Design a protein around this ligand. Structure first.
Ligand SMILES: NC(=O)c1ccc[n+]([C@@H]2O[C@H](COP(=O)([O-])OP(=O)(O)OC[C@H]3O[C@@H](n4cnc5c(N)ncnc54)[C@H](O)[C@@H]3O)[C@@H](O)[C@H]2O)c1
Ligand SMILES: NC(=O)c1ccc[n+]([C@@H]2O[C@H](COP(=O)([O-])OP(=O)(O)OC[C@H]3O[C@@H](n4cnc5c(N)ncnc54)[C@H](O)[C@@H]3O)[C@@H](O)[C@H]2O)c1
Ligand SMILES: NC(=O)c1ccc[n+]([C@@H]2O[C@H](COP(=O)([O-])OP(=O)(O)OC[C@H]3O[C@@H](n4cnc5c(N)ncnc54)[C@H](O)[C@@H]3O)[C@@H](O)[C@H]2O)c1
Ligand SMILES: NC(=O)c1ccc[n+]([C@@H]2O[C@H](COP(=O)([O-])OP(=O)(O)OC[C@H]3O[C@@H](n4cnc5c(N)ncnc54)[C@H](O)[C@@H]3O)[C@@H](O)[C@H]2O)c1
Ligand SMILES: Nc1ncnc2c1ncn2[C@@H]1O[C@H](CO)[C@@H](O)[C@H]1O
Ligand SMILES: Nc1ncnc2c1ncn2[C@@H]1O[C@H](CO)[C@@H](O)[C@H]1O
Ligand SMILES: Nc1ncnc2c1ncn2[C@@H]1O[C@H](CO)[C@@H](O)[C@H]1O
Ligand SMILES: Nc1ncnc2c1ncn2[C@@H]1O[C@H](CO)[C@@H](O)[C@H]1O
Lengths: 435, 434, 430, 218
């Protein structure tokens, strides 16, 4: 079993869309030109677990152009774009992904990426979005000194890396790609500002203008989500546990309250926290009729979906990933993607341009970890650690995306560079800079 | 013992000081929390920071905490004379007036370095821009007499890192600008309100419909662009950092070079903390009655000397608003002689956001002073720059939520373990950018 | 394995019982580190004179958990009962007294295969640099070596030449330049083992003779001292004015080989350099002049020329060749120019070799334990930390009954070190 | 048993003294043992030793614990830079009689009735009771001093030897160290061998030096 996708006949359609996506990903395409001839990932055997979308297809073929062997699976049961998976599969890249996996199928798909490489069959690098692959490899398979690095995409996965580290259970160097400035401050923020509403609208065609929306969390994701809804004329309320994030939201003109303060009136609920049990059994029974409930954090357990399913009197699939529940009170709740990431589960995830930032960081992480396997710069012992990309490379990634937009950079004079204490070519900011 | 423009302005200052205190919940809460235990007893603070109504609340907070204090402004045009008068009337030594000469500015500063109790020297510095710090460390001897400095602004903190790296930092420095509750609030939201306030009090120009060039897209330029854009200006941004550049572009601003818009822009605002942004290359190309202003810490972002030397006419329209006639016949309106326009032409940032900044200053001074005999903040060659702990940054934010009616959700123990923090915080890892 | 005679295992086991009692330091590392096994995982390729002293080193490494494969780093330095004992114990050894140049080469290549896994070594332990040269220039081990520890001045000289040339890929710990090696082994070791080699070889009287010692480094200092201790009049040659002033200040004439070549009864070369005793010297020497080398390689003496141009050569006994020159006079060459202490005797005594080999154990531990700490990137040359230098010395005081004064806190503060040291600054020369 | 102790021990032994040595450093102590000296604690020999020589550069080496145990007419002296290696203040305060035998020789009578001879009141005995080091060895020392002054003074507006915060301690370059030795070989008739180009290459140095790497201990 070398690939498993919904329908291989979708491959041509995928390949048409891949042309458009490549044009929208100038940074990834430029890394292909800059690094392809020198093949920095020759010998790398990368098992990837990341939403199998058109964007991830451009990433995958970039890794392969740089020399890597790659086997791939999605990190969510509803995020695969079947035509993208098909396009990769038809090219001969092993991909085990389809939209609408069972949890059992999900695990089978992941397992498929950890065997079947050349010469011994074992991966030697992981590329992970959410930590599921990392955990399975480190806890359940064996690969115990065979892995030279992991690059982690998302906030929840990065939190899990730091928990693993602190528990003394990180045995491979980890590159924290989420917290590249060109990742967290663009993907998490601007990607969600576009993709949340796309998810909601494709699922429900609900009017946002005039509605009351409750956005749980005001990190980078909730900042973008709040911005998106407000832009269409929703009245957005925000919940938070961090007083700094809470004060930001208030200074931007959002009411900051508890879920319970708005639960009876809000038309739309969006969870963005990366935490569990945000929308619970205490809330669902108080919601107004046809309240839309969705999640954009990494895991569905932000919402008590199992509770809803067990306690609803009726459930109607309106269309795939749109379920309308009738509660005992007679009113309805619309749950999107069974509480899975709504932008990917109900729409297409973030657009290609912002994913080019994220994936340039992933490519640069993989190069950094692989090309340094034998230098001890990123140890695999019990001393294994989490690392960030150097600021110089973060700046490179941003600069790769300015041209498409027509944005022109001023050049510091030597006198100016001296005065602000940086090189003429950067980095331009101290390491603690928050942008 | 003090020197201010007019002591009869004291009563007016004290009226407005009531309003300001009420807008500064966090500072007033620090007064209540720390006042009885007098954590700054024995502290002798020389302050160099814009002598505004907001700074008056800071100063009296430091005094309520047990500090002796002597104060000067860190800009020749930023003093609010009724604020200075209210402080001076209470017997706090202040040497500050709006419209100082550079010579007077230096005399004011020097007055803060003498005249304390018993021996008469300061033992702590509180600076905004680094001018006091440089003067003390390079030009005085107060050598070994100073236990700390807390620094307010990006330009001053940059200079601290330069000194540190030159091996010329000999006192512990608290980087207050780079507290999250400072840089992401004062620099951003304070400028978002006070930039346009400055421009409007100076000129009454309509913002709507104009083309504005915002030079720099840091915390200050983000706020400034946001402000102009909210009133209907078409904002263009310049930057040297590709990350900042991409943020501006993703927010819907054109990112270009000064040269690309110099002929058409109605308003230029420099926000860089760098020099020679608006130059001799530019002024001769500007449209008639282009407004030129700076909100960065020092006026040398704009070549004002060149402007003055090369203009054919200069008319003071009203104080801090000068209209220059160039050889080409057209006019440039320069605000505050290129000094910080929010403070020079208006009142600076509003009290509420300054309460964040100045809570950080008070907690920084407490931290340095109470720890003087502990070795935690070494003086001498091993002197470093420090940030306030995240727990304190979060405390500052929390102090300001109630005024606004913002309510915080409380994590359950389960949730707290899951996100790898304590129920009471800190809630974010040290590298978090907010 | 490959040794001369495995039935000499019994005799070697008996001497190793005496060697063990003379090496308190190595036996004390065996007790301290054996329980925790800090070289577990370690796959040591070894290239160091296969003596009784190295046998106690090899068994320490294996007690510490390491797998080990060994070859001697000189053709005539092996002690055949030493190799026979290690070979019986199950340790793979390829070493006999009197290897040809072909055979010497084969033995080294044996140590780079036959580990577990596709078991290529992950560590090197070197004396002279030859193994380091072979692995780096000619083997494939490119991704596989975490370090090399280098025992001698000549081998270390190469490591610095490589680092300089941008060709050092594996981290190197300079063991020779530990104080407890260079100022002990090189010095006191040679002070006893040089005359041992000469006398076992020739039975010649030292007292009354004129001896030319060429070079006055740590080895030259020791040899001159030894010869002088027996009533030789020693003259010294040097290219370094500092070393020359030291020899002059100790009572020795410093001159050129040519100034004494016609009258010297004994020539010793200690330089680590080539062509010290050459075709221009040999025909000038007095009858039965004894010529030998105690430097790493034999090419301090032009032995090929000697062999090419002698009228007669006679083997008095193994490693003692008596040449008759064109002039009718004779030259007695020892060990064919090979290290004379190891070639004609047993090398340095155990007690001093315990200082050196402790350094080698703590160097291997340091390199290998930090093999996933990123402290020695796979590339620089390093020193053992002075703390461990002092430890080595401290381990050897007890056997001699030496007692160490303990610093008070006042005293340690006053001389600017911890009560338990390091006691000297990093540049101290002892 | 540093450089001073090494010399002092070699001198005493050279005249037929049995020399015992004290040390706090295991390396220096082992050097002393391997040169044939007993290494023991001052307490181990305080009652039997005829001569006590202080060479540590450390204070409180010979103390109130030692003085009252010393044999009759035990000679006590110091050659390290400061006299406080010996508790002379104590000796003076607790002795029952002091006689100047001659300048820089004080004979003290202890409460036990036995005598202590102290040299130069504990000051550097070589300079205090004699003329210090001979000229020839001081020529080495003082050549480095002249070279040092030239290095620092001539390069004063250079930044090679930074002022203030970043001031640091330096050694003379090894080339100059060699120069000084070379200047003293002639008087002694010491002849130096000249490396050939191949020899210098093989050893990895210049023909004219420096000949050793900077870590070399000679
Ligand atoms: N769907 C996507 O395309 C996508 C993209 C980026 C990130 N993510 C995921 O989205 C989530 C959010 O990421 P982020 O970068 O914004 O994280 P973040 O840490 O910046 O922000 C989350 C916020 O939630 C707050 N919070 C935690 N528990 C809360 C609770 N009980 N109630 C209210 N607020 C609470 C925190 O204080 C924080 O400010 C993560 O799970 C991340 O992996 C998803
Ligand atoms: N007026 C006020 O009330 C007030 C308030 C806060 C800060 N400040 C001051 O304002 C200034 C800016 O502070 P900040 O926090 O935004 O700093 P910042 O470092 O965050 O941003 C300044 C930006 O200018 C950019 N830049 C530098 N040189 C440039 C040039 N030649 N052309 C275009 N862009 C350039 C940098 O890349 C950077 O992003 C500083 O001088 C600071 O001390 C003033
Ligand atoms: N046989 C043994 O058991 C044993 C033990 C230790 C070291 N060694 C070896 O002995 C040799 C010397 O070691 P070391 O520690 O004394 O080295 P070292 O560098 O301290 O001493 C060598 C000396 O020879 C001098 N020299 C170089 N070329 C010369 C020339 N052509 N004429 C006169 N003098 C010259 C140098 O100035 C130097 O002082 C090295 O090859 C080392 O590997 C052998
Ligand atoms: N008198 C002279 O003409 C002259 C000449 C040279 C040096 N000196 C002085 O001699 C002193 C020593 O110089 P050096 O070059 O030998 O120093 P050094 O560091 O080489 O030797 C001092 C030794 O004393 C040891 N030591 C420290 N405390 C000890 C203790 N309480 N008991 C026993 N040993 C102890 C140290 O471990 C060290 O090895 C210094 O004060 C120096 O200034 C004087
Ligand atoms: N389109 C996408 N592809 C891959 N990962 C994503 C995407 N959006 C958010 N995360
Ligand atoms: N109002 C203000 N008071 C003091 N400092 C300031 C102010 N605004 C900006 N920086
Ligand atoms: N006995 C020995 N063993 C190993 N190496 C040595 C020896 N002597 C000198 N070098
Ligand atoms: N003779 C001397 N002159 C100067 N200094 C010395 C002397 N001896 C030791 N130190």
């Amino acid at each position: 079993s070398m690939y498993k996708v919904r329908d291989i006949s979708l491959a041509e359609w995928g390949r048409r869309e891949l042309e458009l996506a490549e044009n929208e990903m100038p940074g990834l395409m430029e890394l292909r030109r800059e690094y392809g001839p020198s093949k920095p990932l020759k010998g790398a055997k990368i098992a990837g677990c990341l939403h199998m979308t058109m964007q991830t297809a451009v990433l995958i073929e970039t890794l392969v152009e740089l020399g890597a062997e790659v086997r791939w699976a999605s990190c969510n049961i509803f995020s695969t774009q079947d035509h993208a998976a098909a396009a990769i599969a038809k090219r001969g890249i092993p991909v085990f992904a389809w939209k609408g996996e069972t949890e059992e199928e999900y695990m089978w798909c992941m397992k498929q990426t950890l065997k079947g490489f050349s010469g011994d069959g074992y991966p030697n690098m992981l590329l992970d979005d959410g930590g599921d692959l990392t955990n399975y490899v480190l806890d359940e398979c064996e690969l115990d000194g065979k892995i030279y690095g992991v690059s982690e995409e998302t906030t929840t996965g990065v939190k899990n890396l730091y928990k693993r580290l602190q528990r003394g259970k990180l045995t491979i160097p980890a590159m924290n790609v989420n917290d590249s400035v060109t990742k967290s401050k663009f993907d998490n923020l601007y990607g969600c500002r576009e993709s949340l509403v796309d998810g909601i609208k494709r699922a429900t065609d609900v009017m946002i203008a005039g509605k009351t929306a409750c956005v749980c969390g005001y990190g980078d994701v909730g900042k973008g989500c709040a911005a998106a809804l407000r832009g269409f004329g929703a009245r957005v309320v925000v919940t938070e546990v961090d007083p700094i994030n809470a004060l930001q939201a208030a200074m931007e003109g959002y009411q900051v309250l508890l879920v319970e303060d708005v639960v009876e009136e809000a038309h739309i609920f969006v969870t963005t926290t990366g935490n569990d049990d945000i929308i619970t059994s205490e809330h669902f029974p108080r919601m107004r009729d046809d309240a839309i409930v969705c999640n954009i954090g990494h895991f569905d357990t932000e919402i008590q979906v199992a509770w809803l399913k067990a306690n609803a009197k009726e459930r109607v699939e309106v269309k795939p990933q749109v379920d309308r529940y009738t509660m005992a009170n007679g009113r309805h709740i619309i749950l999107l993607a069974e509480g899975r990431l709504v932008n990917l589960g109900c729409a297409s995830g973030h657009p290609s341009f912002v994913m080019s930032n994220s994936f340039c960081n992933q490519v640069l992480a993989q190069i950094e970890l692989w090309t340094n396997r034998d230098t001890g710069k990123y140890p695999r012992g019990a001393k294994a650690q989490v690392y960030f990309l150097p600021k110089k490379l973060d700046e490179k990634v941003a600069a790769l995306h300015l041209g498409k937009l027509g944005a022109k950079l001023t050049k510091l004079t030597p006198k100016q560079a001296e005065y602000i204490n940086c090189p003429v070519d950067g980095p331009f900011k101290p390491d603690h800079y928050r942008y």
